[PDB]
Design a protein around this ligand. Structure first.
Ligand SMILES: NC(=O)C1=CN([C@@H]2O[C@H](COP(=O)(O)OP(=O)(O)OC[C@H]3O[C@@H](n4cnc5c(N)ncnc54)[C@H](O)[C@@H]3O)[C@@H](O)[C@H]2O)C=CC1
Ligand SMILES: Cc1cc2nc3c(=O)[nH]c(=O)nc-3n(C[C@H](O)[C@H](O)[C@H](O)COP(=O)(O)O)c2cc1C
Ligand code: SF4
Ligand code: SF4
Ligand code: SF4
Ligand code: SF4
Ligand code: SF4
Ligand code: FES
Ligand code: FES
Ligand SMILES: [Mg+2]
Lengths: 230, 433, 59, 43, 217
């Protein structure tokens, strides 16, 4: 019908018009590395971790934002894609603090896992690191802003899902920061979710702080009784 | 005879910007007697297709720096209306170091720009023109507003704009000190009241632009020449410069030259002739020359070995591995610290990044720190190649082309002046051990 | 390099070095280490339980 | 015909509100603005 | 080097949400004129000019000014905070009556911009971030101002002063102190972007209208 045929690593698949490269790769069961893309938030394209090579194209495209074109051949494991991921991980880790033993994200960190899976194993960064002051946005969400990778997921969630425009970015370039710019409590009935969507330990649970690590926990799938939504 | 080979000597009878030096009335009356606002109604009545054709025949390429063919790019808005208004945006940011052409066009020939806006909007089918000017150009913006006011009073714009039947508005919006707002999508975002952060493409502005409506972003120089090309014709404009390098060009010659200035010249003029004729040559003679940045800070620099025989057009400078850029020549003689100049450019780019995307926001600051250490000699030779790779990672992996403009000067310095870097490192090690 | 009885060390200031990362508890092949942690009164990341079962330990 | 004189001295007499005053003056000749159909994107 | 300015706001007795700020009625007329340019339903597009207008009346931007702009345009205040902290021409701290901005980028530096910077520093007795105790001057360094051909150049409260020399920069300061205003433009007998002597081109009388017009038009 209106489906168009595209190839992921030389394999044919039929996709709806306007489907992004990331979703087409997901159709064959391949997950493109990401930091800023969330399928329930608006597309940002800022992290640049999802860059992939299209066959017979010199420039890598951002898979999370670029719509697939008919007859395209994505190449998710080519040398160009791997080197793009390695470079982007390198830039992400350049200013990141050596906080894993004290970070609550420790065993649940998308940054850690994607560094292990797609990045290099070494640092060639020989400068000093940037450090930023902490923000206080209430008693529920602990804030350690140095860890922020500037994904902007928190800003998009608060604006679009929660309906609040309290979060934003001040400054520009290296000094750009995520916050409220004033002493404000990000208080809302859906606020705690910004802990889940934040990929790093920049936003963590204050009640949960330091108590457990993810590998020791046992998971019981259950239902909530705090209201009638279930 | 066709296919000329020695370009770079054109008289004042063929210069579009006749009031470049502001020696003549900058107001409407002046422009009118200088040839401005002539047969505008006839041009408007010829229709968008005829106007688009003239731009196409001329071979006009974007003077903002990228050199994309203007006719094809303007033809992207020749679609029928979809219920959304159409807009033309004039890029008057002029943030590139070494570049001062748009400032002079705005302050001394504003009516050329206003008429160019009218004709371009007619070609695109646009409804109004937004002129985004630099915030630091307060007097230039005020002169522009005076020109637009006297054009409105004389019926040259606004309702029916002429005896034409076409309604067109011209608005001037001032930025607030942001070089990134020169990028077309970042400019669009700054017009809409947001941070000047570039968008991802696709969509291109011809599909979703300002206020979400079809938009075309054109450089002030590109827009200004639009009416002269229409009256003179596409064939006349082309008759200058090499193939695919047609027309005239404004050049800003600055740095270590005897008479820094700006001048209109044929496109394919050799660099040496341009420097020694209009700028008075390099202080200390032509043999005192060390390096030249031909197109503003975003382009890689070239050494004296190349500068003596290279032409000043897009393809020629591409073959020299640098690029024409904004045609902003910065000259540095054998008396300057070549590493310090590149380090200052990298510091400018570090201070001008918008911070949206990871490779720019992190790697340009990283390159700034590495380059500041290179200036002293703190580093080791094994870092030079390392620095090269850092630039490669940044280039082509960022949303915006500011990352390219940050990574290209470093690549040029490493490609042409590596031994100076190595000897600086050796000296620092010698007196530090 | 000799491996003997276990000990928990301090910084020269007298502050404990352990920050309750639980890497020792994760790596221990005998599961001899038991750790419980909470924020200290001054907000520090410190342990409230740190046990080693010396008859489980393989040293 | 004198090409040795720089006429451009209008800007010397420009004050802080000159640009905005010209904007207010030009607000009269303007065509009616198009509307998206909302008061705001949050309406 | 590093920016120096902080991108968080901490309340002070002189800068808090209750600091008195309001537009003049004339500024409200100007705000209405500014708002009208943009399409209906896209009123926010006026954040950039109106904010600037506030700074043109007050001198700087207190947090109350940002709140007032946000309330007038019905934009969330954090959006105005983003705009204010992004653009470098917005003053989130008080400045002197005269804001001296000297360009130090590469084309401007190659023509001895450091000489101008040191001359200003020794004339005013302040550094490249400080304000004179009389609260008349504030000196900072800026990137390329687009007046590279006229380098070294300085920008003061919307006036460019170009082709500067140490003696020249000092006199402008003297003229600004004694209650006069100096004429902007080059300070070397140039008054243009022209070559410093000779006028290599644009010497012929300008051509009359319709001179090069093509046939059939
Ligand atoms: N005039 C100044 O002060 C400055 C100029 N520049 C120059 O800007 C250049 C880079 O600008 P970019 O826009 O990133 O280059 P680009 O090649 O990506 O595009 C330039 C123009 O062509 C249009 N375009 C390109 N491909 C298109 C397509 N497939 N469909 C429709 N439209 C298309 C773009 O919309 C844009 O208007 C640089 O070469 C730099 O020299 C940079 C800084 C300042
Ligand atoms: C960081 C950056 C800054 C830019 N600044 C300007 C500018 O100040 N003026 C301009 O005309 N183009 C500037 N450009 C290039 C614009 O993309 C260009 O103007 C646009 O594509 C249309 O220009 P054209 O008329 O030459 O095709 C800039 C590009 C980048 C990446
Ligand atoms: S966020 Fe992840 S990478 Fe960063 S310190 Fe915490 S665990 Fe380590
Ligand atoms: S705090 Fe977390 S979600 Fe918010 S921008 Fe930083 S990394 Fe992204
Ligand atoms: S390349 Fe730099 S200026 Fe361009 S979008 Fe990315 S961070 Fe912003
Ligand atoms: S929990 Fe174990 S590994 Fe972590 S700091 Fe304490 S003793 Fe060391
Ligand atoms: S078995 Fe003993 S020595 Fe080995 S990791 Fe466990 S506690 Fe340490
Ligand atoms: S996931 Fe695509 S740019 Fe971040
Ligand atoms: S470098 Fe000084 S004005 Fe351009
Ligand atoms: Mg988190």
């Amino acid at each position: 019908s209106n489906l168009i045929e595209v190839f992921v690593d030389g394999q044919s698949v039929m996709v709806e018009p306007g489907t992004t490269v990331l979703q087409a790769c997901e159709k064959v069961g391949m997950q493109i590395p990401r930091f800023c893309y969330h399928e329930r938030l608006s597309v940002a394209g800022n992290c640049r971790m999802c860059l992939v090579e299209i066959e017979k194209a010199p420039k890598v495209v951002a898979a999370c934002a670029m719509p697939v074109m008919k007859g395209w051949n994505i190449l998710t494991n080519s040398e160009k894609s791997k080197k793009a991921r390695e470079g982007v991980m390198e830039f992400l880790l350049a200013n990141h603090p050596l906080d894993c033993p004290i970070c609550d994200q420790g065993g649940e960190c998308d940054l850690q896992d994607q560094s292990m899976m797609f990045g290099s194993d070494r640092s060639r960064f020989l400068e000093g690191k940037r450090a930023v002051e902490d923000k206080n946005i209430g008693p529920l969400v602990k804030t350690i802003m140095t860890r922020c990778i500037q994904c902007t997921r928190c800003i998009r969630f608060a604006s679009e899902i929660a309906g609040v425009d309290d979060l934003g970015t001040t400054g520009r370039g290296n000094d750009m920061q995520v916050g409220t710019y004033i002493e404000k409590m990000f208080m809302s009935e859906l606020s705690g979710n910004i802990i889940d969507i934040c990929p790093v330990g920049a936003l963590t649970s204050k009640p949960y702080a330091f108590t457990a690590r993810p590998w020791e926990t046992r998971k019981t799938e259950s239902i909530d009784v705090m209201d009638a939504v279930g | 005879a066709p296919k000329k080979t020695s370009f770079g000597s054109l008289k004042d009878e063929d210069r579009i910007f006749t009031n470049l030096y502001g020696r003549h009335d900058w107001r409407l009356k002046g422009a009118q007697s200088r040839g401005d606002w002539y047969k505008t109604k006839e041009i408007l009545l010829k229709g968008p297709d005829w106007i688009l054709g003239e731009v196409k025949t001329s071979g006009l390429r974007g003077r903002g720096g990228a050199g994309f063919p203007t006719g094809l790019k303007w033809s992207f808005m020749n679609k029928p209306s979809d219920g959304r208004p159409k807009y033309l945006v004039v890029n008057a940011d002029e943030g590139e170091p070494g570049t001062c052409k748009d400032r002079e066009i705005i302050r001394h020939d504003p009516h050329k720009l206003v008429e160019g806006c009218l004709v371009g909007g007619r070609a695109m089918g646009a409804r109004a023109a937004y002129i985004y000017i630099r915030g630091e150009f307060y007097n230039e913006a005020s002169n522009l507003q005076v020109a637009i006011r006297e054009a409105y009073e004389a019926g040259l714009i606004g309702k029916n704009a002429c005896g034409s039947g076409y309604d067109f508005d011209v608005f001037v919006v001032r930025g607030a000190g942001a070089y990134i707002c020169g990028e077309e999508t970042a400019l669009i975002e700054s017009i809409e009241g947001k941070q000047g952060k570039p968008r991802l493409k696709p969509p291109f502005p011809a599909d979703v632009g300002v206020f979400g409506c079809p938009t075309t972003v054109a450089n002030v120089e590109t827009v200004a020449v639009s009416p002269t090309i229409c009256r003179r014709g596409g064939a006349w404009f082309a008759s200058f410069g090499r193939e695919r390098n047609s027309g005239t060009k404004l050049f800003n010659i600055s740095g270590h030259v005897n008479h820094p200035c700006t001048v209109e010249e044929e496109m394919s003029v050799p660099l040496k002739e341009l420097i020694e004729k209009h700028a008075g040559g390099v202080i200390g003679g032509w043999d005192n020359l060390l390096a030249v940045i031909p197109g503003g800070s975003s382009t890689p620099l070239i050494p004296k070995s190349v500068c003596e025989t290279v032409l000043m057009d897009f393809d020629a400078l591409v073959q020299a591995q640098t690029g024409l850029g904004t045609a902003a020549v910065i000259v540095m003689d054998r008396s300057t610290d070549i590493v310090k100049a590149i380090a200052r450019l990298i510091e400018f780019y570090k201070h001008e990044s918008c911070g949206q995307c990871t490779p720019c926001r992190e790697g340009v600051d990283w390159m700034n720190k590495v380059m500041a250490r290179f200036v002293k000699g703190d580093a080791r030779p094994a870092e030079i190649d390392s620095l090269w790779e850092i630039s490669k990672q940044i280039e082509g992996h960022t949303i915006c082309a500011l990352g390219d403009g940050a990574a290209w000067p470093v690549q040029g310095l490493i490609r042409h002046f590596r031994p100076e870097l190595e000897e600086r490192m050796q000296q620092f090690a010698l007196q530090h051990q | 390099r000799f491996r003997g009885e276990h000990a928990l060390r301090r910084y020269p200031s007298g502050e404990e070095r352990c920050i309750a990362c639980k890497l020792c508890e994760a790596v221990c092949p005998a599961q001899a280490i038991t750790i419980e942690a909470e924020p200290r009164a001054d907000g520090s990341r410190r342990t409230t339980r740190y046990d080693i079962d010396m008859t489980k330990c393989i040293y | 015909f004198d090409n040795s004189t720089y006429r451009n001295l209008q800007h010397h007499e420009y004050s802080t509100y000159t640009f905005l005053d010209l904007n207010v003056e030009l607000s009269k000749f303007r065509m009616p603005q198009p509307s998206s159909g909302r008061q705001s994107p949050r309406h | 080097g590093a920016g120096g300015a902080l991108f968080v706001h901490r309340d002070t007795p002189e800068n808090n949400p209750d600091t008195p700020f309001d537009f003049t009625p004339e500024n409200y007329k100007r705000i209405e004129a500014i708002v009208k340019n943009y399409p209906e339903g896209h009123k926010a597009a006026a954040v950039l000019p109106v904010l600037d207008l506030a700074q043109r009346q007050n001198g700087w931007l207190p947090i109350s000014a940002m709140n007032k702009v946000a309330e007038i345009l019905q934009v969330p205040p954090m959006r105005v905070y983003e705009v204010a902290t992004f653009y470098t021409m917005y003053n989130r701290k008080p400045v002197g009556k005269y804001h001296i901005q000297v360009c130090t980028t590469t084309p401007c530096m190659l023509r001895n911009s450091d000489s101008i910077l040191e001359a200003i520093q020794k004339k005013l007795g302040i550094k490249v971030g400080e304000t004179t105790p009389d609260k008349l001057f504030t000196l900072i360094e800026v990137e390329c101002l687009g007046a590279c051909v006229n380098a070294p150049m300085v920008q003061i409260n919307d006036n460019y002063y170009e082709d500067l020399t140490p003696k020249d920069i000092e006199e402008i300061i003297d003229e600004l102190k004694a209650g006069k205003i100096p004429k902007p433009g080059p300070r070397s007998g140039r008054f243009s972007c022209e070559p410093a002597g000779g006028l290599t081109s644009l010497t012929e009388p300008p051509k009359g209208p319709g001179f090069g017009v093509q046939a059939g038009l």
